[PDB]
Curated annotation (Swiss-Prot):
NCBIfam families: photo_yellow. GO terms for biological process: phototransduction; regulation of DNA-templated transcription. Pfam families: PAS (PF00989). One of its GO terms (molecular function) is photoreceptor activity. This is Photoactive yellow protein. It comes from Halorhodospira halophila. CDD domains: PAS (cd00130). SUPFAM superfamilies: PYP-like sensor domain (PAS domain).
Amino acid sequence: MEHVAFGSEDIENTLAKMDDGQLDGLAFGAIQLDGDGNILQYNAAEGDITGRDPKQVIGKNFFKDVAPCTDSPEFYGKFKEGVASGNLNTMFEYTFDYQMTPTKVKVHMKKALSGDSYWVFVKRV
């Protein structure tokens, strides 16, 4: 297991070193998005949480295709405000409920160290 705590203030630095294999080692869900919301990486843990196969969702749009739950002012609206501003660091609870058992999660979105990408980190609550 890669030893990184959900919500760590320097998480973006830590994760900058990780390849997709090392990301699968994390104790929580992790998704990397571009500024348009397309999925760049998606880890083994998120898959546990949501049922989705990671390999298959890479390249799809998270807000339009993969995760309609999140197309709302409360989730997407926060994301897009962050991309436009060039800063984002927010943490909230949410329920995922598209084609799955409604599952309550804590979400943390943060801008990545890298140019124009963003992290969504997810854990059960």
